[PDB]
Amino acid sequence: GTSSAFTQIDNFSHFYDRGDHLVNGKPSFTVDQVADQLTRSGASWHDNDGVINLTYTFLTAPPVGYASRGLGTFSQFSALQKEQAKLSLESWADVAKVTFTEGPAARGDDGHMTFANFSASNGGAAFAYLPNSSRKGESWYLINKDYQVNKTPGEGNYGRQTLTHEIGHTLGLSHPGDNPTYRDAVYAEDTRAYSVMSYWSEKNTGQVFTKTGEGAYASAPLLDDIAAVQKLYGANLETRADDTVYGFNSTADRDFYSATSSTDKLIFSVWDGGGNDTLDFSGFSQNQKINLTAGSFSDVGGMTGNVSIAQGVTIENAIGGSGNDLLIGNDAANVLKGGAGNDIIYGGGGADVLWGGTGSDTFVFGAVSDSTPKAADIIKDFQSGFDKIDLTAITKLGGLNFVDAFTGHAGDAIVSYHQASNAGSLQVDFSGQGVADFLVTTVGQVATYDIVA
Numbered sequence: 001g002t003s004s005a006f007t008q009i010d011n012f013s014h015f016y017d018r019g020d021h022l023v024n025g026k027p028s029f030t031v032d033q034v035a036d037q038l039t040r041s042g043a044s045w046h047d048n049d050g051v052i053n054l055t056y057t058f059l060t061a062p063p064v065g066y067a068s069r070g071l072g073t074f075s076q077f078s079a080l081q082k083e084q085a086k087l088s089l090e091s092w093a094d095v096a097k098v099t100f101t102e103g104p105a106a107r108g109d110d111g112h113m114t115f116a117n118f119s120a121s122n123g124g125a126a127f128a129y130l131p132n133s134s135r136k137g138e139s140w141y142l143i144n145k146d147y148q149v150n151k152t153p154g155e156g157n158y159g160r161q162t163l164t165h166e167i168g169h170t171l172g173l174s175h176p177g178d179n180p181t182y183r184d185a186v187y188a189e190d191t192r193a194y195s196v197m198s199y200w201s202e203k204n205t206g207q208v209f210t211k212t213g214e215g216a217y218a219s220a221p222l223l224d225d226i227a228a229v230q231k232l233y234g235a236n237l238e239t240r241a242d243d244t245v246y247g248f249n250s251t252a253d254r255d256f257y258s259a260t261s262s263t264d265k266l267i268f269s270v271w272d273g274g275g276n277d278t279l280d281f282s283g284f285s286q287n288q289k290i291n292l293t294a295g296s297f298s299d300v301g302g303m304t305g306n307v308s309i310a311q312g313v314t315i316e317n318a319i320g321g322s323g324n325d326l327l328i329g330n331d332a333a334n335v336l337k338g339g340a341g342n343d344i345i346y347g348g349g350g351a352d353v354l355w356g357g358t359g360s361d362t363f364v365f366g367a368v369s370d371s372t373p374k375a376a377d378i379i380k381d382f383q384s385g386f387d388k389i390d391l392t393a394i395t396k397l398g399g400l401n402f403v404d405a406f407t408g409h410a411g412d413a414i415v416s417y418h419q420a421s422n423a424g425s426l427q428v429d430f431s432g433q434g435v436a437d438f439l440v441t442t443v444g445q446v447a448t449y450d451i452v453a
């Protein structure tokens with residue numbers, strides 16, 4: 001078998017797997033299957049420049065025919081709503097080739113949107129129309145004494161998510177399915193852990209973002225939303241194409257990608273056009289499970305399934321917090337830092353740079369190709385007697401034969417140390433060709449007893 005450490009890594013890497021199986025009695029849909037689902041109406045704005053340029057107006061007066069809509073008193077968006085709306089608009093433009101410019105409809109634009117409030121509850125909390133309808137571009141928001149959610153939209157609250165959700169609808173995204181409850185969902189991932197378009201909470205799929213009496217809602221497009229809107233309009237590869245840090249010490253310049261306190265409730269899906277990026281969750285004290293796999297989910301900031309990387313995005317670095325975290329790299333050369341606590345770090349393929357941080361850290365290797373002589377990982381702060389290099393996924397617990405020189409026998413391993421440069425190394429000849437086919441270098445001495453195999 002393998003160690004528990006490896007099993008924890010493997011289990012997490014597969015924890016949110018989607019497609020080809022039932023979950024909650026419903027088919028599990030992959031991101032692409034949901035992208036189709038969310039765009040099943042066939043409505044979209046049309047381009048051309050290969051970009052959809054929309055204009056939008058915060059209506060200052062009721063349109064012609066307004067009174068017939070049964071919405072009651074019309075009112076213009078407040079400055080706060082306009083500010084939040086713009087942030088919501090921006091979060092969509094960030095991921096797909098659609099732009100929103102405040103202004104009147106213009107012959108040069110691909111469509112025009114309108115935003116406004118109404119006071120009669122009968123109109124519903126908020127609503128919008130698909131771009132193929134006669135009321136294309138419109139979204140309306142209820143505000144009255146009995147319903148105040150839309151009066152103060154803000155990062156993380158439902159008021160902001162409503163703006164995001166309604167704009168998504170005006171862009172052509174349908175709600176995930178047609179006294180309905182999650183039981184009526186067409187697919188398993190129809191919850192707001194995967195899409196802001198969903199009516200159902202993340203609890204239905206097992207994620208935990210918050211507790212009773214508190215609201216926690218992604219302010220920006222989530223994993224499936226991004227897939228859906230890019231399917232419609234193409235991915236916007238221009239955004240944050242330089243190096244970007246998301247989370248703590250964020251350089252993403254987006255309120256929803258920023259954490260400044262251990263109590264922050266991050267719920268976001270990372271879209272990025274390139275560069276050398278980092279998910280920095282160093283400010284959290286809770287156990288985290290960070291997955292750098294494209295399209296995968298992470299448990300961040302004491303919550304679960306709240307962070308994800310959009311399909312097509314390569315995130316290279318991760319920094320855990322003070323909790324006992326799991327860090328899973330991808331094929332790229334990753335820099336993974338555990339932070340305090342007892343972490344389990346899995347670099348994956350490519351030559352990685354691993355920092356255990358303080359605590360007792362375990363560096364897991366699941367395949368020889370994870371760390372070869374020509375592309376070796378380096379553990380920058382290995383602490384013998386406390387840290388561990390775990391090769392059980394490879395050796396299946398068969399053990400290693402620690403020698404001073406490869407004898408041509410498979411399983412032979414060599415622990416070396418270079419006192420002058422405080423550099424250590426673990427070489428292994430798994431295949432038994434008489435030469436190392438696996439290599440891990442360290443800063444700090446490694447002893448045979450620090451190896452789990």
Ligand SMILES: [Ca+2]
Nearest residue numbers: 240242244275
């Ligand atoms: Ca970037």
Ligand SMILES: [Ca+2]
Nearest residue numbers: 274275277314
């Ligand atoms: Ca990158």
Ligand SMILES: [Ca+2]
Nearest residue numbers: 321338340341
């Ligand atoms: Ca940690």
Ligand SMILES: [Ca+2]
Nearest residue numbers: 338339356359
């Ligand atoms: Ca650590």
Ligand SMILES: [Ca+2]
Nearest residue numbers: 329330347349
């Ligand atoms: Ca890697």
Ligand SMILES: [Ca+2]
Nearest residue numbers: 348349350370
């Ligand atoms: Ca590696």
